[PDB]
Symmetry: C2
Subunit: 108 residues, 2 copies
């Protein structure tokens, strides 16, 4: 497999599994596009991915995602992942909240 | 049952079921004791509660808790719940994290 530590500026056809650590806040380009920076990672480290428009709304921290045919470049100083137009982002994992009753555990 | 909106300063023997919205933050005294103030609520509204030392530290957001014999005062200008002596906090509900495999959901479906 490919690892985040092995990612450098100019890399191409990146096939990479990662987990979302952070979902940054969305900014707007000159042409009305919504762009959002996410901090994603594997055990070998973290990296930024730039995500565009509605894809941005489909991502939460904890999400396990497979990137296909991605590429890396520098944007405003930061190393950044991008989805290739002939590629894909695939969610293969997520963490969910489940309610559980508790037998009157006392804090004291 | 009692509801947050009906709580005034000086009201004692407060029995109240609430959910924790914010675990809030920690004030530490010079004698080494910590109090963390949380933001809790019911359908009628929210309110602050201060908890000392170990009591409030496996309090998590989403927790459903019952306070017995609590009392209401003013702290840092805000209406605040305290646990009165002879009182208790009981965790009766919680939300826990579980993993969920996703069968290949393309983000460009």
């Amino acid at each position: 497999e490919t690892f985040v530590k092995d990612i450098k500026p100019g890399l191409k056809n990146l096939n990479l599994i990662f987990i979302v650590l952070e979902t940054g806040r969305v900014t707007k380009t000159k042409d009305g596009h919504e762009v959002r920076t996410c901090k994603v990672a594997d055990k070998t480290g973290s990296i930024n991915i730039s995500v565009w428009d509605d894809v941005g709304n489909l991502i939460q921290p904890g999400d396990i995602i497979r990137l296909t045919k991605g590429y890396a470049s520098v944007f405003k100083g930061c190393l950044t992942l991008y989805t290739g137009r002939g590629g894909d982002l695939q969610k293969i994992g997520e963490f969910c909240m489940v309610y559980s009753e508790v037998p009157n555990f006392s804090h004291h």
